[PDB]
Structure 1
Amino acid sequence: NPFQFYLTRVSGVKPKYNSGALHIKDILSPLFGTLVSSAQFNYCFDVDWLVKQYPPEFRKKPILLVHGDKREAKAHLHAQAKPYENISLCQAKLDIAFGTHHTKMMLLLYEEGLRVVIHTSNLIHADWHQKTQGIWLSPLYPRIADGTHKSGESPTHFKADLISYLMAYNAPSLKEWIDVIHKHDLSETNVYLIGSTPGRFQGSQKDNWGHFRLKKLLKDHASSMPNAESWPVVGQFSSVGSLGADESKWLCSEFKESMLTLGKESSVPLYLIYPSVENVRTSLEGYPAGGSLPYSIQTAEKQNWLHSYFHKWSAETSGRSNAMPHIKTYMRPSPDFSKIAWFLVTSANLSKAAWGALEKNGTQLMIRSYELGVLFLPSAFGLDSFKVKQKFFAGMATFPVPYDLPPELYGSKDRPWIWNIPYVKAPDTHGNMWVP
């Protein structure tokens, strides 16, 4: 398959639903390349667990952990890594309040080349155990011979865009990785990079990041079709930010407007997929799955209008209806959900912090967080649209959507999972209630 989009292995589903899945030990195995050095960009780390996922023969190779932690959290991460002399740390600067380093990425330098992995999982055991998570695996990128002068660039500009993303950190440990990427040939890449980085972007930088980056790519590299206003937008996420007092404040004004863009010219249904309380209760993990779905009652009660958009998590297509989602995806299906105009897998949840919010009379895009995803556009594959794969693991130009379509609206008795209130009416799959 040309897409190289995978789900993580889930403990407890039948083998047929893990056949094409990847565990972190598979990604780091010597079958993928002979590791020389790696960088792990992430939010949450269990360093003892993480080192055990590398093959024994590679556990002393240098590892860089790129994180956003401050103060006591930073001390704790440094303490975790001190037993391992080969581990260095890079603290991503977060100069805007309430920002986080959410990007999940592996840079894997081998004897044979370089690989880039952009994914959705934290580096802790529970994120790879019984969750639905997404992985994009780059090709093996060869080294450019010393003395040869070539760009190593792809038609999607992935090499320059990844270097731009790393340059935004202004970090000495990542200048070394930038130099590594410069030395490799990434021309075979068929995905577009969509990143967020903290800052206030105007003028020539406005389209570099966040939902304006998505808008720019859709304007330039997708085409509008007749009846485009009948093609829904689907957003699927594991937490929600404060979006405002009504949909016109951000969700259906600037966010949806970027998501609806197609082509260069100047009432679309919006489906938002987010686990209900029942989804969490009956899940493989039970209520503890809700520890990774951090929607607070304080936020939720200020935006009850939002929940009329919510649809249940359902993933019979991939055997994962009971594996709660930590993947985030956004896509543009046809009115009958048989095709899609594009697909994005990302770390970005449904929040202004991740996607950006316009400021200063619409001239400035303010982003609080680091995020990273990859965009699949039919034009990058020589196609007008992607056919949707009917079963995720069945069966080559059909795109494997990991959850069921069309999405199913919350029932009248359903409620969105809200993590900091108690659920004491019905026990979960392990026999427990939820008392925060």
Structure 2
Amino acid sequence: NPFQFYLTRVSGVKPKYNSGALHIKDILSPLFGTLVSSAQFNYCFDVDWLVKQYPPEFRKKPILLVHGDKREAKAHLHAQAKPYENISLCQAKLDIAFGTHHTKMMLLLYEEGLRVVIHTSNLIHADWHQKTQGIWLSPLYPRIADGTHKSGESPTHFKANLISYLTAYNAPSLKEWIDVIHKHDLSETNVYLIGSTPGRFQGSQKDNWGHFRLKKLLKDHASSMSWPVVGQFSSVGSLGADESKWLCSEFKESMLTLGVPLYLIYPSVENVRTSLEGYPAGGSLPYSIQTAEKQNWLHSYFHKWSAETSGRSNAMPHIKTYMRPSPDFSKIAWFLVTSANLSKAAWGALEKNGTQLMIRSYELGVLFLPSALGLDSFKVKQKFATFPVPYDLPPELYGSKDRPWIWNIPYVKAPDTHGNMWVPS
């Protein structure tokens, strides 16, 4: 398996659907290596739950929490962590407003080497229970022989890209992790790192982050050949008064680069209502009425969540994926799993028009490029050399009575799976 792309375990589906899936307990297990230290980058944390996901033998080993919390929320997280002597925290500077530290990554240092995990789940019980989530597992990276001179770099430049990503934080405790990475051989890595980092970027630096990073990687490492772009996510930024402000202009332009139908997959009310969680799935799908009412044009790009291929049509998506299928969806030019939702905050927007890219948040993803495997395209694995696309193709359009799930309005005409209504406030 050259991909090492996985879904999380979903509670309440048949065991056959969890056979190739991983729980956080699986990732942290002694079978994955003899843990010495770990860093956990995320947005939301439940420290008590988190510490229990580590096996008993590893629970006292040092853990770093990399979060973006401020003020009182910062205090609460510190309070939450206080009991656990072995836990430190690193607050990621969020200088631009409406930015979040959204990246989901684990750095796992073991006796036998190093592992990097990039995924889509918050570190809270609910994100790993009945959600469709994604995970990329690096190989076990060996330590570089104390007597030798080598870069430990891959053809995808992953090691140097991860180090730059970590460097942008400008944080003391990450420098230690940067130095651990320096010591290790990451040359077997076959994915490309796509990061977002808060700032305003100019010159050659435009290419470093966000969708421009993607544009660049697709220019240099894909080739040209009516191939649709598919984008799938769980949160929706304010995109502008029409598609030309951002969506089809700079964002789709980046996505269509190589060497055009746009499908966007976002759960409908109906998807959420009849899900395994019911309406409380929508607590993880924060599309507000305020933002939605500003951009009604967007919703005609919207397609339902369907995932019979992976038995997860009723496990609401918290995964975020972007890809470029052929016209019949039998193959793809590339695949991206990432923390980046459909927002300017996450992907970046052009300022002082043309000259500046403005990114608000920290985001991280891995891009699977056929060229990194020596191929021209991947075949889509129909039932979750052939990439495991975790939802159904082609994506199905919203029916005329469907609406996008919007989290802050009531749904009281029909009960959900659990016979409840949804009344926010």
TM value normalised by structure 2: 0.99
Identical pairs, percent: 99
| Deviation for aligned residue 1:427 | 0.3
Runs of 4+ displaced beyond 3 Å: none
| Deviation for aligned residue 1:413 | 0.2
Take 1:46 and 1:147, find their aligned partners in 2: how far apart are those partners? 42
Take 1:147 and 1:359, find their aligned partners in 2: how far apart are those partners? 49
Take 1:59 and 1:111, find their aligned partners in 2: how far apart are those partners? 16
1:130 alignment counterpart: 130
Take 2:126 and 2:359, find their aligned partners in 1: how far apart are those partners? 29
Take 1:418 and 1:433, find their aligned partners in 2: how far apart are those partners? 14
**Secondary structure, counterpart of 2:150 in structure 1:** coil
Q: Per-residue CA shift, 1:212-232, capped at 9, x if unaligned?
A: 00000000000001xxxx100
| Deviation for aligned residue 1:236 | 0.2
2:181 alignment counterpart: 181
1:197 alignment counterpart: 197
Q: Per-residue CA shift, 1:286-327, capped at 9, x if unaligned?
A: 000000000000000000000000000000000000000000
Take 2:14 and 2:382, find their aligned partners in 1: how far apart are those partners? 18
| Deviation for aligned residue 1:361 | 2.2
1:220 alignment counterpart: 220
Take 1:12 and 1:405, find their aligned partners in 2: how far apart are those partners? 24
Take 1:224 and 1:32, find their aligned partners in 2: how far apart are those partners? 39
What are the within-5 Å matches in structure 2 for residues 52-201 of structure 1?
Answer: 52-201=52-201
| Deviation for aligned residue 1:148 | 1.2
**Secondary structure, counterpart of 2:244 in structure 1:** helix
TM value normalised by structure 1: 0.97
**Secondary structure, counterpart of 2:299 in structure 1:** helix
**Secondary structure, counterpart of 2:179 in structure 1:** helix
**Please, which runs of 5 or more residues in structure 1 have no aligned partner?**
none
1:321 alignment counterpart: 313
Q: Of residues 396, 400, 412 in structure 2, which corresponds to 1:412?
A: 400
Take 1:13 and 1:382, find their aligned partners in 2: how far apart are those partners? 36
Take 1:40 and 1:361, find their aligned partners in 2: how far apart are those partners? 36
| Deviation for aligned residue 1:149 | 1.2
Take 2:251 and 2:310, find their aligned partners in 1: how far apart are those partners? 29
| Deviation for aligned residue 1:123 | 0.3
Q: Per-residue CA shift, 1:187-241, capped at 9, x if unaligned?
A: 000000000000000012110000000000000000001xxxx100000000100
| Deviation for aligned residue 1:20 | 0.3
Take 1:187 and 1:13, find their aligned partners in 2: how far apart are those partners? 37
**Secondary structure, counterpart of 2:208 in structure 1:** coil
**Secondary structure, counterpart of 2:207 in structure 1:** coil
Q: Per-residue CA shift, 1:41-90, capped at 9, x if unaligned?
A: 00000000000000000000000000000000000000000000000000
| Deviation for aligned residue 1:175 | 0.1
Take 2:73 and 2:274, find their aligned partners in 1: how far apart are those partners? 33
**Secondary structure, counterpart of 2:280 in structure 1:** helix
Take 1:144 and 1:364, find their aligned partners in 2: how far apart are those partners? 39
Take 2:419 and 2:248, find their aligned partners in 1: how far apart are those partners? 40
Superposed CA RMSD in Å reads 0.7
> 1:249 and 2:245 equivalent?
yes
Take 2:382 and 2:17, find their aligned partners in 1: how far apart are those partners? 14
| Deviation for aligned residue 1:4 | 0.1
**Secondary structure, counterpart of 1:215 in structure 2:** helix
| Deviation for aligned residue 1:146 | 1.4
What are the within-5 Å matches in structure 2 for residues 262-411 of structure 1?
Answer: 262-263=258-259, 268-391=260-383, 397-411=385-399
Take 1:331 and 1:354, find their aligned partners in 2: how far apart are those partners? 17
Take 2:203 and 2:184, find their aligned partners in 1: how far apart are those partners? 31
1:435 alignment counterpart: 423
| Deviation for aligned residue 1:147 | 3.0
Take 1:334 and 1:300, find their aligned partners in 2: how far apart are those partners? 31
Take 2:421 and 2:213, find their aligned partners in 1: how far apart are those partners? 42
Q: Per-residue CA shift, 1:118-140, capped at 9, x if unaligned?
A: 00000000000000000000000
Take 1:292 and 1:363, find their aligned partners in 2: how far apart are those partners? 35
| Deviation for aligned residue 1:145 | 1.4
Take 1:70 and 1:309, find their aligned partners in 2: how far apart are those partners? 35
**Secondary structure, counterpart of 1:249 in structure 2:** coil
Take 1:149 and 1:39, find their aligned partners in 2: how far apart are those partners? 27
Take 2:271 and 2:98, find their aligned partners in 1: how far apart are those partners? 29
Q: Per-residue CA shift, 1:340-364, capped at 9, x if unaligned?
A: 0000000000000000000012011
Q: Per-residue CA shift, 1:14-37, capped at 9, x if unaligned?
A: 111000000000000000000000
Take 2:2 and 2:392, find their aligned partners in 1: how far apart are those partners? 22
Take 1:212 and 1:12, find their aligned partners in 2: how far apart are those partners? 40
